[PDB]
């Protein structure tokens with residue numbers, strides 16, 4: 001409950017910033033919405049608290065909390081639990097609101113994403129609507145190829161996501177090369193399903 | 200209003216430091232002036248507050264706040280909004296007082312500047328007074344050439360500025376090479392207007 | 399005694415996190431146990447406090463506190479006190495609970511360990527039980543060879559340990575090459591005692 | 598005066614640490630002495646406070662505070678004021694007590710020192726007593742040659758010092774190569790005065 005306190009003072013700081021910068025009504029709305037969904041009335045130093053513990057405990061926990069994510073994700077579900085653990089360790093949580101552009105075709109990409117809860121759409125130059133849902137991932141292709149985002153990804157609903165930064169994606173994939181081919185294979189299918197080809 | 204509180208305690212800390220170091224009257228004046236102009240009676244953790252939000256929101260906002268800057272700047276105004284966004288993300292705000300030397304001819308340079316509000320003068324070995332004003336930029340040439348500051352830049356008024364550090368200038372220019380030629384071209388004109396030439 | 403205060407509020411933060419994440423009874427138990435053993439009712443900013451001091455003092459102290467460790471460790475005990483000092487400077491303290499897997503055969507390794515108090519067991523594919531105790535070290539082999547953990551290490555009791563990260567192991571071993579051969583030699587004996595061979 | 602408060606609570610934290618670690622009487626004495634001399638009853642966040650200001654102001658100030666240091670130091674006194682400014686920017690303050698070993702012959706070196714107030718002695722294998730005093734510097738030779746400390750430096754009195762870390766020494770010397778030869782020359786004389794020779 002110290003945290004249901006922090007929450008309301010932080011959102012008081014937020015409101016101030018908005019005032020000083022004179023942001024428009026529907027933009028203050030947008031930001032207020034996101035806050036509720038992002039923090040849901042509570043704020044605490046997740047990271048700090050895990051830092052006080054050792055690895056074994058840190059790994060039991062992350063494994064427990066991400067239990068449904070691992071289980072509904074063919075790639076994780078069917079993998080070396082240790083790879084899973086490595087991966088889960090480096091995920092950072094994120095929230096997107098409906099109509100947000102998580103990824104823009106063209107852009108340079110430094111992150112990939114795991115869908116916890118939500119629906120998201122894959123768009124190219126008239127590739128129709130391709131939907132990804134819980135236990136799906138996107139944003140891998142860019143990272144592998146070191147070239148540019150091969151399509152745009154828009155949030156169709158509120159999207160609860162876990163993201164993995166490029167350095168982290170590569171550190172882990174250094175340790176588990178077998179798991180690179182796993183990514184690569186689904187990526188060639190994805191590029192094959194839309195009609196693209198890459199070096 | 201928590202921030203109109205912080206302000207006055209921070210400037211109380213400042214006054215103490217000055218006392219312990221026995222700084223002269225007109226130097227304490229100079230520092231007091233700058234404080235008022237730099238913070239204008241208020242202090243808050245801009246960065247912190249943007250960190251709690253996601254990218255879409257962070258980008259809407261920075262775009263809104265820098266609206267006049269983008270619009271009065273041929274280079275930004277006539278560019279890929281995404282390049283603009285990339286750029287705006289990495290700008291840090293700065294204040295200079297009249298007669299300050301923002302850049303010294305000769306020096307190694309690690310920053311460039313965008314004039315928000317103010318007037319500034321370009322000086323070389325008898326190149327007269329060349330003035331840059333709102334929606335102008337300077338300090339690019341050094342960064343491009345990786346050699347030394349090609350002229351001095353003095354603040355003729357109070358100058359409100361946004362600066363961009365070298366690593367950031369290059370990260371963005373990696374992503375938008377077309378925009379490098381834009382810089383390069385105005386730079387050759389600038390060196391041509393004063394009579395200099397560089398590898 | 400400010401620290402016997404901090405302790406109880408921090409463990410209050412811990413309890414909250416557990417609640418919000420709905421961790422199971424024996425896992426909250428496990429975490430509560432570790433806390434007592436790890437901090438033993440008290441928390442203070444060891445690092446912070448050493449940072450205020452200079453090197454000479456920082457070195458006297460670390461030498462004093464690690465007095466029994468150095469003295470019961472053939473490798474340290476019989477070495478250049480300065481090497482010892484360098485080493486001791488970079489050790490970070492850690493606690494493991496009985497049945498924890500400190501190191502997993504196969505894994506990539508970024509740390510090595512010094513046993514202060516406790517017993518630990520070395521396991522391979524039917525290599526029986528090999529026990530290491532106070533003033534022993536393990537996890538060196540991986541670091542030297544830059545290849546993978548050559549066996550698993552499990553905590554048989556509560557284990558009080560000091561660990562040394564790879565960068566630190568190498569920085570020091572750059573300065574004291576003679577001391578590399580010391581490590582290398584015991585490592586070849588260790589690999590010889592279990593029947594393994596490495597490039 | 599907020600700072601004459603902080604001081605006494607910090608030294609209360611220090612006392613606690615000592616108790617928990619059961620340090621000997623003359624070692625608690627040694628640490629208490631140093632505290633008085635190092636902070637002299639007051640503590641404040643020098644760095645923090647300079648961070649709020651811009652460069653021009655930051656440079657005026659550091660120049661003012663180090664006025665006697667620059668003026669009694671042939672190397673600084675007779676140099677490009679800008680080089681001086683660059684240098685002064687990166688100095689960190691340090692205190693040593695009588696009989697401390699600031700530098701040990703043999704060791705790898707990552708710092709050099711400027712004597713503000715104090716006396717210090719240069720020792721080799723029977724090179725007698727060579728004393729350096731206010732406006733002198735030492736620890737340069739190592740940094741230049743990238744090899745090892747060429748002699749030991751002991752504090753003969755309480756020594757008030759400013760130190761410059763290797764990266765910083767090189768960054769500045771990149772910008773002012775002329776000033777490298779200045780260092781190099783005095784270094785060859787120093788090695789010539791004791792009878793040593795180096796690649």
Ligand SMILES: Nc1ncnc2c1ncn2[C@@H]1O[C@@H]2COP(=O)(O)O[C@H]2[C@H]1O
Nearest residue numbers: 122138139140141142149150151190193
């Ligand atoms: N056929 C597909 N089905 C689902 N998702 C896709 C498909 N093709 C591309 N994507 C995703 O859209 C992402 C756009 O960014 P990336 O190129 O980094 O990675 C791309 C894929 O992860």
Ligand SMILES: Nc1ncnc2c1ncn2[C@@H]1O[C@@H]2COP(=O)(O)O[C@H]2[C@H]1O
Nearest residue numbers: 321337338339340341348349350389392
């Ligand atoms: N002809 C010009 N008109 C306006 N500004 C200039 C001109 N020439 C040089 N400058 C600016 O002065 C700056 C001095 O530092 P730089 O060499 O980094 O970059 C230089 C330019 O940005």
Ligand SMILES: Nc1ncnc2c1ncn2[C@@H]1O[C@@H]2COP(=O)(O)O[C@H]2[C@H]1O
Nearest residue numbers: 520536537538539540547548549588591
């Ligand atoms: N014969 C042995 N006796 C004791 N410890 C060992 C022996 N062989 C290996 N180990 C330790 O087990 C560790 C497993 O990880 P490393 O390969 O990094 O380093 C290994 C050694 O430090």
Ligand SMILES: Nc1ncnc2c1ncn2[C@@H]1O[C@@H]2COP(=O)(O)O[C@H]2[C@H]1O
Nearest residue numbers: 719735736737738739746747748787790
């Ligand atoms: N002849 C000398 N007179 C004064 N100081 C010296 C002399 N020779 C060496 N020193 C200092 O002692 C220092 C020992 O460490 P360094 O080799 O890094 O740098 C050395 C010099 O800065």
